Amino acid sequence: ETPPAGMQYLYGSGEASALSLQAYQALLAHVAAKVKVRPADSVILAEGAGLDDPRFVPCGAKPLAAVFDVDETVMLNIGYEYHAARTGRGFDTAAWDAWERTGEAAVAPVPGADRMVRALRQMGVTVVFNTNRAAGNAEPTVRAIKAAGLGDAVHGQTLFLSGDDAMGSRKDGRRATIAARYCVIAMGGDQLGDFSDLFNGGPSVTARRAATMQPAIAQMWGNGWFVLPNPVYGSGLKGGFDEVFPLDKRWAAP
């Protein structure tokens, strides 16, 4: 009779709201500093850079911008996750497609996303969305973004979707398009693929966690790359016992 713990946490708890507000406060402070003192590097990795040796698209004289993942980064998909909890069928690509098409009035903003987006625009920073919602559902997604109070997104200018190129769920191509036009000074997401495709398509659960602590990646967290919680679905909900609970740290009760 109770929803899954991850959904209780993410959608129900004050803990999760405080955590999200924290991310957006750190992001606004970071953008503010960069608006006063424009950086040499943008926050989007250069083509061909690896997690071994991160290099970035330079900032240049391009217009300042912030890039956001949509789902569980600025918008909470309450309707869909209600359905998943009611039915137990969270993995259902056809129902997800229906949801992309008809869910625009069952979303809520992530706590602080509305204030955060308004502030970015008042600082002269363009807000750009890069989501793996499908291109053919661009218009319902625009209306869902507007309904969540996040403003007016425009396909191919400030909204980039899966299928806008032939890389599928890989977002690096769209990041490159975006970084070719703007100086992206902050990027927000709830999954590591919202920052680099290099975290996915191969690396194990333990490899990906280690990669976030690589020094040139680790410096980005809360300082260019901003993270929102998602213990409900996606690339964080993987791994067996040996990858979640490493064996030097195990213990048995008496």
Site for Mg ion in 57-76 (CB under 5 A): 69, 71-73
> 88 by DSSP, 3-state: which?
coil
Query: Among residues 166, 171, 102, 99, which one has the least CA distance to residue 131?
Result: 171
Residue type at 187 in one-letter notation: M
Residues 26-85 that bind ligand ADN (CB under 6 A): 80-81, 84
Tell me which DSSP letter residue 248 carries. Answer: G
- 236 lies in the binding site for a copy of itself (CB under 8 A): yes
Residues 53-82 that bind a copy of itself (CB under 8 A): 78-82
- 114 lies in the binding site for ligand ADN (CB under 6 A): no
- 153 lies in the binding site for a copy of itself (CB under 8 A): no
Tokens of 198: 């290099």
Identity of the residue, 30 or 133, whose beta carbon is nearer to ligand ADN in the bound complex:
133
Among 18, 167, 180, 216, binds a copy of itself (CB under 8 A): 18
**CA pair distance 8, 232, nearest whole angstrom:** 9
- 241 lies in the binding site for ligand ADN (CB under 6 A): no
Q: How far is CA 153 from CA 23, 25, 64, 68, 96, in A?
A: 22, 22, 16, 12, 21
64 pairs with which residues across the strands? 183
Identity of the residue, 158 or 190, whose beta carbon is nearer to a copy of itself in the bound complex:
190
Residues 158-197 that bind a copy of itself (CB under 8 A): 190-192
- 96 lies in the binding site for ligand ADN (CB under 6 A): yes
Among 50, 102, 146, 157, binds a copy of itself (CB under 8 A): 102
State the residue for tokens 């495709």. Answer: 197
Residue nearest to ligand ADN (CB): 90
State the residue for tokens 């990795």. Answer: 45
Which of Mg ion, ligand ADN, a copy of itself, none does residue 69 bind (CB under 5 to 8 Å by kind)?
A: Mg ion
**CA pair distance 74, 20, nearest whole angstrom:** 10
Binding segment for ligand ADN among 22-30, 33-41, 86-94, 175-183 (CB under 6 A)? 86-94
Q: How far is CA 146 from CA 96, 105, 225, in A?
A: 20, 10, 24
Residue type at 250 in one-letter notation: R
Strands (E), 121-242: 126-134, 159-162, 183-189, 225-227
Minimum distance from CB of 11 to ligand ADN (Å)? 11
Identity of the residue, 122 or 249, whose beta carbon is nearer to a copy of itself in the bound complex:
249
Binding stretches for Mg ion (CB under 5 A): 69, 71-73, 190
Binding stretches for ligand ADN (CB under 6 A): 80-81, 84, 90-93, 96, 232-234
